[PDB]
Design a protein that fits this description.
It is classed as viral protein. The complex is a heterohexamer, with three copies of chain A and three copies of chain B. In chain A, a hairpin with a 2-residue loop joins strand 4 and strand 5. Chain A is 50% helix and 14% strand. Chain A is of the alpha+beta class. In chain A, helix 1 runs antiparallel to helix 2. Chain A has one domain: Alpha-Beta Complex (Hemagglutinin Ectodomain, Chain B). In chain A, the strands form two sheets. Chain A has a two-stranded antiparallel sheet. In chain A, strands 4-5 form a two-stranded antiparallel sheet. In chain B, 8% of the residues lie in helices and 35% in strands. Chain B is built from three helices and 31 strands. In chain B, strands 9, 10, 14, 17, 20, 22 and 23 form a seven-stranded mixed β-sheet that branches. A four-stranded antiparallel β-sheet of chain B has the order 16-21-18-19, with no helix packed on it. In chain B, a hairpin with a 2-residue loop joins strand 26 and strand 27. The chains are: A alpha+beta, B mainly beta. Chains in contact: A-B, A-C, A-D, A-E, A-F, B-C, B-D, B-E, B-F, C-D, C-E, C-F, D-E, D-F, E-F. The interface between A and B is large, with 81 and 67 residues. Strand 3 of chain A pairs antiparallel with strand 29 of chain B. The structure holds a molecule of 6 linked components (NAG-NAG-BMA-MAN-MAN-FUC), a molecule of 4 linked components (NGS-GAL-SIA-FUC) (3 copies), a molecule of 4 linked components (NAG-NAG-BMA-MAN), a molecule of 3 linked components (NAG-NAG-BMA), a molecule of 3 linked components (NAG-NAG-FUC), a molecule of 2 linked components (NAG-NAG) (3 copies) and 2 more. One 2-acetamido-2-deoxy-beta-D-glucopyranose (NAG) binds next to loops of chain E.
């Protein structure tokens, strides 16, 4: 991955996160929890669906063409009929091998990129009240119960409320 | 203090992460030949339904007959007389059962007829003065009587004259007429004179634009249903306003009329698959196939709305992120 | 106040334009540029290339020397133009493998012709016909020499012509098929004619084909045009005993960059390096949707009529 | 895009910014103001013009080819003549559809990257004298007049001069 | 009591320029060429079985031109035809010459089996001063030039059934004399004819009396034809004059063999790709040497050079 | 560079680093030093080698085909045989032109990425004990000897050990 988050600074995925592609796990005063993030998940799915719309259920109608198998030998004009079909197939085969390879490199990148977007988004919320521990975890420098964690997940965490307390716990 | 599931009362840990599955699937990329992702979807169609679906395109089973033997009117192909198709299916176990013949440039006629998608025939009352009509053979039995191709008229001498036959037929329809005619090559000079009087035959079908001339070719051939003689089919196309003319002093296998040429999206396919009531907009010699995927490995020969044939039997497009499992050891 | 705020941002426009991407079908961006040429000028531009109007004539009739196609005696072209309203007004004919002869001349790009003193002893030359009226007389295709009997009989001709040059000579000849046997003997004496044109590496025999055809201008008979190519150092030979429509000379074959194109559009003065039947097109874009048939420096034909390449960022107004 | 800045953590574009592609808006002791950044703007334009050079005025010269329209019905070799031309058109049609798709995807990503490059460039200049408010806005914790802003735009801002002041405003 | 840690990347003295989507020229630390544009100079004979036609073309070797007798039961993966090859037997022509050349080239073998065609009432083994084998008049070895025996030439009626598991290739011909004297001298009948037929197909050919230009002292000609015969079918031949008879069949194969025109030298080396210019290596995906090729070959393209970056952007001080 | 590290906020490459693509240069109580980061170097090389193995020798095996040079002029079917080979060659010429152009853009972007990955990795270890000077250099606010620098390079640097000493130096004057 190009951003180095998935299979990077995040050691591994969570197999117990069945209701999302991206999300949080927390440990606070009320216990340890888990929770998916629907926005980021949907961002990744939608792009992936975007690619599927271009490739799936997309075919040309074709009718009469040229013969591609032969009973007798006929030299020149059959050599030509064969070469044409052989040339066409090799060219379409290349196009397919390349389409997939490209899209896949890009799928892995845009997912890795969405994981990084969530981390940056959350970093901005928490502001001076937490620090990057590495591994994808923040250490929040104030008591933050389940409601408080929800406010971060909801996108409604006002950092000014805990700022003074937090600065004190970081430096003293 | 060790199993405490809480944090130390004035801090908390907020970890960000992503999902992962116990059984991922490998894909190809620009930089990796095999790389595990959470999920993928096959882009190459390599399974066939097993049979040809005949509710999408009109599929005509030719059974024991080829498209040409249907057109000419070989007796055992009489069923196909007046019939149209999107795809004509030719079987491997098919055979001919009339007078032995050859069609110089067979393939072209076969294609021309196939694309048109119809054997609709219109008889024209040609005047053939001075000759015996409706020749037949034991090599082409209709019942227990000698007979011939239903769309051809074998002409022989009448009494002591094979006159110079001189007949025209102006295309006044608003479409192109297709004419099938031919010439007889007998197996000896005794026969050439016995049937046509003249020592040396000739056939000349002509338009205002084009012409074709053929001479018979005397000499024995291998037996086919008891007959050393042979026939050769040729074809002519007449356009609206143009006129047909047929000149011959011997060996003519005259036409009984024309076939009506359409500009069509129809075709012909060599296949031994069963035809059946199912749903599919793409047909191949192996059977019909679905067209949800963009590519296919079933057959390069196809008719209809089909995925494009490639050499690869599989190409996986990733529909999920890199898979990075939790448990190194299960 | 002793603090400040410094915001960063990007530009946008009232209404942008929609493009395709790998993940979106449509998505707004600030600007784009069209890569498919959809529309032509209307005329065929006769400036960058030497366009030659056929008007009433085909390339084949021009070569053979149809009385009304005399204009094109020694003319050349990069692109020959054939009108739908053209016709032949000479002796009725056909050509086996017509398209191929037409292709070979168009490619050579020239009707440069050099006559040769063939010796046709024992036969009356320069035969004509009412169907091919030139000016006001029974004439014939200018490049072909119709040979007939000389009173008593028509001898076995046997004529040679060696290629001394170092380029390919193109020869055009044919054979006459009459409408009756009484005619076949009236002009060619013998019961059945024959034409055997051969080189030291090749040969072609055509037998005439007596019998009436449909009525074209008043004539029941026909002429079938054939052709032969003699290489450097090689030698031509023609051996006929009846029905020979002999050649007068040879055409020069140049390996060229020329062609022929069917069209009914106006040829006129303008700038362009690409030519289609619909007219000339500008070749600034990589692709085009006008007409698959083209000549010159041309955008590649595709089936789409529009493709916008994004030349700006994502557009996000306020 | 993939960096999540344009149509991302920056809420929307500025229609008022007509003298550049990326830039700054700022308020201070002297009031509000706007100013474009030429370096970032020009980095993006060069890359887009770079693509135009590969696409625009790149045209193969061709002469006599094969006949593509037919008055008569011929069969075998006409069937081929068409199929050849039909194969060619489809493949170029695909090459064109894909080119545009990839280039556009890429264009969005590079324009988004330049936006982000400028943000990270600014963040580094400020160092400890400012915080990331979000929306791509910085709170500069000291009196920063027009001349001061100019140095941030010019890349000549010396963070040590205001350090003791801003740092004192940030924690107290 | 402080320190400085700097993160960085390498650079080289002399990088190398490459194309990108954005830049026509941009310097990187290294690259690798994807267009193979230089050839070894000569054709390598160790990888594939290369066969030098020398003074013979493929067709002359098949027919059995006396100076081509060395190529009798030969086989090849690739058969090399030299610009200096010449025909030295009776003068001939072959309608659709290219097709027969292709078919034999593909089969990759001149394995000929002779058969006992019974020709009665005719003298066999006609020859010519135009086709000398040693100092004596001779002919194409695989062909049999029949003429009248005694004072007549019958309507020949011969069969030969293909009771084999493969397609049989039959090469036959017709003779065209230079006059009616010569037509009636050799064959009696004033008008010759050759009909070669199967149960499926047939071919009739009329000769054409008339003088052609001298080739090795002869103004006559033969036109060569062929007939392929399938398992279970039966070849019949009927002629009252001018027949240039077959002596047997060539065993056809579906094979991976071919024929190439080249004047390149053929020497001991190794390479899995062959062109008219010489063999080329195949480590690169593309090439610009020649569009004519045989073997495991890079694909031919217009461009003579295409550099793939194998390193990062090169940024020196 | 899509991240703007190589040829961006990092001013230039180091010709003096000859046993690695990425790495460190440092100044501290024991002198100055340089070491290559094996892990990031290998990440790029592995990715670049993947591409090589995709393109490099994946050639088909063709045998007998159609003719492509001619002596005699012929017309229709020779026109076709020429048009087909010409059509084929042009498409493969497009494919190779694009292939190279896409790969190189990607090769540049992915090398640029490994650089920025290494930086961010390092920044996260240092935490509150250093600041970003610009130019890809950190300013570590404690006595960080060659062993300390080594622990940063190993990814075993324990910031709590120096946190007090560091926080103390950053917020002073
Ligand atoms: C990834 O792996 C998942 C995990 O599944 C498995 O668990 C691992 C640890 C191993 O033990 C594996 O052997 C095992 O597969 C996959 O999920 C499973 O997917 C399979 C098919 O791939 C499902 O098979 C179906 O089982 C249905 C009944 O399920 C219950 O009983 C079975 C034992 O019989 C157990 O496996 C389950 O755990 C359940 O307890 C069954 O109803 C289905 O067949 C039906 O249809 C047929 C007609 O053909 C009919 O005759 C029959 O009566 C049935 O009604 C079928 O056999 C499996 O259930 C599912 N299991 C779970 C727990 O999810 C997953 O497929 C895979 N993903 C990918 C992409 O491969
Ligand atoms: C009422 C009637 O039958 N009158 C006789 C004429 O017959 C015919 O009239 C012409 C207009 C034509 O349409 C015929 O189809 C029609 O029957 C006859 O006129 C001629 O008849 C012959 C018969 O084939 C030719 O058609 C002949 O054609 C010419 C020509 O093109 O003008 C004469 C020309 O010199 C000649 N060129 C040669 C020998 O090099 C050609 C050539 O023979 C043919 O093109 C070969 O296919 O034809 C036309 O004149 C007249 C004249 O007869 S005469 O013997 O020529 O004197 O006689 C009426 O009784
Ligand atoms: C000046 C003169 O009249 N001299 C004749 C001489 O005629 C000629 O010389 C030869 C070399 C040739 O170039 C002729 O074009 C030239 O006019 C007679 O020589 C024979 O001529 C005949 C033609 O009538 C043949 O060319 C024949 O050549 C062979 C040959 O070598 O190919 C002899 C073969 O035995 C024969 N093979 C057969 C029948 O199977 C072939 C074959 O007939 C021919 O290729 C078919 O197209 O021809 C020359 O031997 C010379 C002897 O004439 S003879 O008595 O009829 O044999 O008499 C001089 O006075
Ligand atoms: C042992 C013996 O000599 N028996 C002969 C018959 O010889 C043959 O047997 C027949 C069945 C064929 O296999 C022949 O090839 C074989 O020689 C001979 O039978 C007649 O032979 C004729 C050939 O010369 C015909 O084949 C004829 O049958 C037809 C046919 O059914 O196809 C009869 C048709 O009416 C006729 N159609 C026409 C003229 O339009 C055709 C036609 O002639 C040929 O197809 C043209 O190529 O032939 C068959 O009965 C007879 C001779 O009888 S006959 O009076 O000459 O007719 O004599 C036995 O003793
Ligand atoms: C030139 O030669 C030709 C072939 O060498 C001659 O043709 C032959 O003519 C005879 C007599 O007319 C035919 O005899 C007939 O053969 C058929 C074939 O049946 C075969 O298959 C069945 C299978 O059960 C088997 O029972 C038979 O024994 C045969 O093997 C018989 O059905 C008839 O009763 C009859 O006897 C030959 O068939 C035929 N041979 C070939 C190969 O075509 C021809 O007569 C000669 N022509 C001239 C002008 O001289
Ligand atoms: C019809 O005309 C042709 C064309 O002229 C005649 O062919 C020529 O025949 C003569 C001998 O009869 C050849 O002469 C020979 O030339 C060679 C040259 O190397 C020389 O070595 C001999 O001594 C002899 O003089 C001449 O080459 C040949 N024409 C060619 C090759 O172009 C033919 O005789 C005529 N036939 C009839 C039936 O009228
Ligand atoms: C990661 O590095 C630390 C730091 O110490 C050093 O780094 C080495 C790569 C090398 O440059 C060495 O000269 C330098 O001292 C390692 O700690 C050291 O471990 C060794 C045993 O391997 C001990 O002998 C040292 O006392 C110890 N020093 C300190 C200060 O801790 C550490 O082992 C290494 N870890 C890994 C996983 O490689
Ligand atoms: C937006 O794109 C348009 C074209 O889509 C550009 O306008 C063209 O600019 C160049 C000048 O070199 C020329 O091709 C034409 O004169 C212009 N008009 C066209 C092609 O229609 C331009 O780059 C952009 N214009 C904006 C942003 O206002
Ligand atoms: C055979 O018949 C054709 C037509 O069926 C005759 O051609 C016609 O000839 C007359 C003049 O006598 C013309 O007015 C007509 O235009 C011709 N018709 C066509 C269709 O060409 C022809 O004369 C006859 N020929 C023979 C040899 O009998
Ligand atoms: C991912 O792979 C595919 C989609 O990319 C999913 O398979 C399809 O799921 C839906 C059913 O809701 C339908 O489109 C088809 O019935 C499924 N495919 C079949 C039957 O081949 C699949 O569910 C996804 N896998 C995971 C693990 O999420
Ligand atoms: C956001 O959260 C506020 C309180 O915390 C909550 O946690 C959430 C995850 C939710 O499920 C509930 O347990 C609580 O609401 C709440 O006051 C706000 O209303 C929430 N706002 C929005 C827009 O969701
Ligand atoms: C928990 O926090 C309180 C202050 O709220 C403090 O007095 C107490 O010592 C803390 N204990 C631990 C172990 O953090
Ligand atoms: C182009 O053709 C037209 C046809 O009328 C003519 O007027 C004009 O002079 C021609 N232009 C050139 C440059 O030959
Ligand atoms: C940038 O602006 C500052 C203050 O406005 C000024 O002192 C300096 O000269 C400028 N630098 C450059 C390089 O333009
Ligand atoms: C760089 O690539 C070239 C050409 O592919 C090769 O010869 C050379 O050894 C390589 N150099 C390095 C340092 O990898
Ligand atoms: C190889 O041979 C061809 C055929 O003549 C020649 O034109 C071409 O330039 C040569 N290619 C080389 C030497 O790479």
């Amino acid at each position: 991955g190009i951003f180095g988050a998935i299979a990077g600074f995040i050691e591994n995925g969570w197999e117990g996160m069945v209701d999302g592609w991206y999300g949080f796990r927390y440990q606070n005063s009320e216990g340890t929890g888990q929770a998916a993030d629907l926005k980021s998940t949907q961002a990744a799915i939608d792009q992936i669906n975007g690619k599927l719309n271009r490739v799936i259920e997309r075919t040309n109608e074709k009718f009469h063409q040229i013969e591609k198998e032969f009973s007798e030998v006929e030299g020149r004009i059959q050599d030509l009929e064969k070469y044409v079909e052989d040339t066409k197939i090799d060219l379409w085969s290349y196009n397919a091998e390349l389409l997939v390879a490209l899209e896949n490199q890009h799928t892995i990148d845009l997912t890795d990129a969405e994981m990084n977007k969530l981390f940056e988004k959350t970093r901005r919320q928490l502001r001076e009240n937490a620090e990057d521990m590495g591994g994808g975890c923040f250490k929040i420098y104030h008591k933050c119960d389940n409601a408080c964690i929800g406010s971060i997940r909801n996108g409604t965490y006002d950092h000014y409320i805990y700022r003074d307390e937090a600065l004190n716990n970081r430096f003293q | 203090p060790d199993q405490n599931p809480t944090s130390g009362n004035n801090t908390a840990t907020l970890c960000l992460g992503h999902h992962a599955v116990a059984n991922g699937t490998l894909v190809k990329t620009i930089t990796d030949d095999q790389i595990e992702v959470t999920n993928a979807t096959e882009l190459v169609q390599s399974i066939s339904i097993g049979k040809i679906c005949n509710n999408s395109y009109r599929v005509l089973d030719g059974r024991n007959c080829t498209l040409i033997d249907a057109m000419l009117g070989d007796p055992h192909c009489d069923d196909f007389q007046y019939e149209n198709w999107d795809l004509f299916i030719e079987r491997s176990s098919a055979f001919s059962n009339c007078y032995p013949y050859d069609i110089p440039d067979y393939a072209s006629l076969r294609s021309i007829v196939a694309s048109s998608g119809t054997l609709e025939f219109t008889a024209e009352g040609f005047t053939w003065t001075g000759v015996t009509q409706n020749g037949g053979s034991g090599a082409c039995k209709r019942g227990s009587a000698d007979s011939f191709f239903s769309r051809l008229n074998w002409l022989t001498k009448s009494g002591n004259s094979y006159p110079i036959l001189n007949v025209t037929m102006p295309n006044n329809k608003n479409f192109d007429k297709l004419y099938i005619w031919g010439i007889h090559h007998p197996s000896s000079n005794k026969e050439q004179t016995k049937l046509y009087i003249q020592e040396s035959g000739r056939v000349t079908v002509s338009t205002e634009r084009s012409q074709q001339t053929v001479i018979p070719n005397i000499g024995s051939r291998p037996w086919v249903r008891g007959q050393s003689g042979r026939i050769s089919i040729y074809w002519t196309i007449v356009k609206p306003g143009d006129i047909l003319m047929i000149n011959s002093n011997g060996n003519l296998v005259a036409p009984r009329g024309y076939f009506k040429l359409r500009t069509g999206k129809s075709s012909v396919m060599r296949s031994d698959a069963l035809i059946d009531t199912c749903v599919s907009e793409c047909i191949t010699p192996n059977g019909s196939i679905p067209n949800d995927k963009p590519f296919q490995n079933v057959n390069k020969i196809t008719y209809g709305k089909c995925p494009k044939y490639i050499r690869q039997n599989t190409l996986k497009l990733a529909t999920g992120m890199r898979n990075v499992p939790e448990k190194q050891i299960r």
